[PDB]
Write a protein that binds this ligand. Structure first.
Ligand SMILES: CCN(C(=O)c1cc(F)ccc1Oc1cncnc1N1CC2(CCN(C[C@H]3CC[C@H](NS(=O)(=O)CC)CC3)CC2)C1)C(C)C
Ligand SMILES: CCN(C(=O)c1cc(F)ccc1Oc1cncnc1N1CC2(CCN(C[C@H]3CC[C@H](NS(=O)(=O)CC)CC3)CC2)C1)C(C)C
Lengths: 462, 462
């Protein structure tokens, strides 16, 4: 049952009306996760899922799907009735505002058992409670979010969303010290629903961030649903309206302090600001730096994406030195992880940096150097950043249950090395931490680069 | 030839961006009438002229046509180049910032000779310079507005819009003391273009308001184009977007003091607030009473529509006593006019009030009274307001070159009288101003209503 103060801000007829609803909910101690997620999913459904005067507006039309109270109230009542109907709190000895693992598992099972048996896990627009209620489809992290929403609907104030950079689960109990898996991760992995994350933290996988993962409060859970907005209409086109809505909502959260402990939300906001800068706001670079400051302050500098967001920006702006330094800093965080079997998404990022982005950046630099025959390619410190990147990757691989380096990496390493003259490479000042790079130090600086020797040494398993 | 400060808040992506452009222009000594009218006309053209999840948005969509600088700048340059191209200011000596009548007539003829030869004069969405430039079509008052816009584009600071409650012309020269007709009025009337309004003022027609017409400054000309917004998509549906735009622009004008001397704009704003109240704003009644205060203060209480706006609100809200008092007040203004051959629009309003609106209001009161077998029909003051309404109509007729009353008015008078019992009618002690009502004062209050005697008196000559 929606309170009177919630009803008076319907109907929603614009992006600013949505922003106003978020503003009002975020002024409460319990922003209503179910109401806000239903609204975002409704809007995304109709802007993305179900997508002499000029004969059509010459600058295009933008659209907004009117959200009537009668529609949103009906979806809300359906969700709350399903959860309250399925969970008898009197059956769950819950001593002093701490939920039991058995109660968290019950709520989790109610969400899980409601889902359609068959759908693609990478399907777009199945993140929201709108998708849950109207299509019985949720994506992996959508299940975790829906468990937290369901727990809020039951008054279980201790159940919160936990987030790594690629996975979601719940924290509960006194001080949020208990953990439970509530959803799947990846494809064809062992079912760990119900389990703690203690094994994941101990194994030093990126997926569990060595325990430096996000423990959300209710306001951060609102920030999560805003980052979860998916503007994609199809493979090659985005809803401008959903980008603008996400941008405005992230600025609201920013102003209220709710992105302070949310590095990826700051990087998301920086990316939107690069697309369309907001008058009077910090520039993207300031926001990427705030993301890194957040990771340093709250997460022991154990996050990878803050550095990837920054390096990406420098790449797009042809800041060759700064991009290489940021990719070096990325590798310096990953080297203190072990590459585990559910870490593939961050492997994909390092693969793309090593084998595509760095080669294209150094190629652009080679073209600049040619035109008017000081370049990053003539700078030993820039070469040192390239080597520090590879050193971090090699150190990440050490002690890991899955290999990282393959002969394909060696091809790109040889191409990247060859962008720097022998006399520049021979001036490099570096101490390596990885056995592989220590072993390869003569090959990396040789005037004539030996591709066969670099391939053998980079890909050794020994 | 747009200034840099104007370009920076394109593109316009929302209703609030349009409001921000109006706010910026209204902070200048010469708000740019051509830019503002082009923007409103562009937005109106694309929002009204050219316009388990539900399969279609269940509350519909709202739209906004993005207004790019390149589109609006192109239309602006077309207008300014056409006017500056066609009018050689070197041929019209102009000491002391007073335009000559021949200069005003030239600019008027340039607008007039640009128009399409054949189009419906009451066509919707041909009020703006957008319509003029892209369709060579303007409605009656649109021509007057475009003459003023063209004079501003030529730097003629003394040329202003004049409007009555049913007509527009221009005022110019020292103190706006010169007048020129620049457009047509009504259908099948003799053309007065190039003439002063002196004959209209002297005849005491409603059309020229006995000289108590609006003499706009540039800020009031902005208020005019905002009132001119036409949200109608077709006979039975309005653009919510254009209603919201008009409402927000009228509140901007209100806050800046620009509706102080604009009774009809205050009535328009009251009507919009009744449809969709703005949190924290005065209620409709406060606004209707501000409109009447404006008419009393600045226009000698010689305007009709302020009272019609109030009467209309009370009618819609079934406030029978207050509606009749407001119609009585409307008749008390008209009685000091002469009914002239181009006053048809206000004749239609009085005819409809006498022969439809008051009959329906008294019938509804009679139904309420029947169901409780106190009523407005038991209130002598309600009867006195009905008599004052007819008394003002009869006094309006006196000395008029067009008769007002005829046998078509008699049956409704007799029926309205008969809604009040003899004992109620016999409590009033009033002295009539009209010869016609004086000549049946006993008949109006007699226990038995003599319908044929009242008809003979109401239809008597003069
Ligand atoms: C994006 C969807 N999403 C998650 O993937 C997610 C799910 C979880 F359970 C836990 C974490 C999750 O990630 C995020 C959570 N909160 C906010 N943002 C999240 N994102 C943004 C994310 C990382 C960055 N990338 C964009 C990068 C990709 C690499 C790119 N560098 S480059 O290779 O192009 C160099 C030029 C820069 C932009 C998008 C996806 C993951 C959430 C928001 C539902
Ligand atoms: C509205 C269009 N318009 C004019 O008609 C106009 C043109 C002129 F040359 C000179 C005056 C003009 O009138 C206005 C000027 N400025 C603002 N508003 C003008 N209006 C509003 C206007 C009078 C009132 N009526 C509305 C009444 C009609 C009766 C109604 N009674 S009811 O409630 O029982 C039925 C809903 C109450 C509201 C609409 C048209 C004329 C201008 C703005 C271009």
């Amino acid at each position: 049952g929606l309170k009177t103060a919630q009803k008076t801000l319907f109907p929603l007829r614009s992006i600013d009306d949505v922003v106003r609803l978020f503003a009002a909910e975020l002024g409460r101690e319990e922003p209503d996760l179910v109401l806000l997620s239903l609204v975002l999913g409704f809007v995304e459904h109709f802007l993305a899922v179900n997508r002499s005067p000029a004969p059509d507006p010459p600058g295009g039309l933008t659209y907004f799907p009117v959200a009537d109270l009668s529609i949103i109230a009906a979806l809300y009542a359906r969700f709350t009735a399903q959860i309250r109907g399925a969970v008898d709190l009197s059956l769950y000895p819950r001593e002093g505002g701490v939920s039991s693992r058995e109660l968290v598992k019950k709520v989790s099972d109610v969400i899980w058992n409601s889902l359609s048996r068959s759908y693609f896990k990478d399907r777009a627009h199945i993140q929201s409670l709108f998708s849950f209620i109207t299509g019985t489809k949720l994506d992996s992290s959508g299940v975790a979010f829906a468990v937290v929403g369901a727990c809020q609907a039951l008054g279980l104030r201790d159940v919160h969303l936990a987030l790594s950079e690629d996975h979601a689960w719940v924290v509960f109990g006194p001080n949020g010290e208990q953990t439970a898996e509530v959803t799947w991760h990846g494809k064809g992995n062992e079912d760990r629903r119900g389990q703690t994350v203690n094994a994941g933290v101990a194994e030093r996988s990126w997926l569990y961030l060595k325990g430096s993962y996000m423990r959300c409060d209710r306001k951060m859970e609102v920030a999560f649903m805003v980052c979860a907005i998916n503007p994609s209409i199809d493979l090659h086109t985005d809803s401008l309206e959903l980008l603008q809505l996400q941008q405005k909502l992230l600025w609201l959260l920013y102003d209220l302090g709710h992105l302070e402990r949310y590095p990826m939300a700051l990087g998301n906001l920086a990316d939107l600001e690069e697309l369309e800068p907001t008058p009077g706001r910090p520039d993207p670079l300031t926001l990427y730096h705030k993301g890194i400051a957040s990771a340093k302050t709250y997460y022991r500098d154990e996050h990878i994406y803050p550095y990837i967001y920054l390096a990406g920006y420098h790449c797009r702006n042809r800041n060759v030195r700064e991009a290489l330094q940021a990719w070096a800093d990325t590798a310096t965080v990953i080297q203190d992880y072990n590459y585990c079997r559910e870490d593939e998404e961050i492997y994909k990022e390092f693969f793309e940096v090593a084998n595509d982005v760095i080669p294209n950046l150094l190629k652009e630099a080679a073209s600049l150097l040619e035109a008017g025959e000081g370049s990053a390619l003539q700078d030993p410190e820039c070469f040192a950043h390239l080597l520090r990147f590879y050193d971090g990757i090699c150190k990440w691989e050490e002690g890991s249950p899955t290999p990282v380096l393959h002969v394909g990496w060696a091809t790109f390493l040889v191409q990247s090395l060859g962008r720097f003259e022998g006399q520049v490479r021979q001036k490099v000042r570096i101490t390596f931490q990885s056995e592989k790079m220590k072993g390869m130090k003569e090959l990396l600086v040789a005037t004539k680069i030996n591709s066969s020797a670099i391939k053998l040494q980079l890909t050794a398993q020994s």
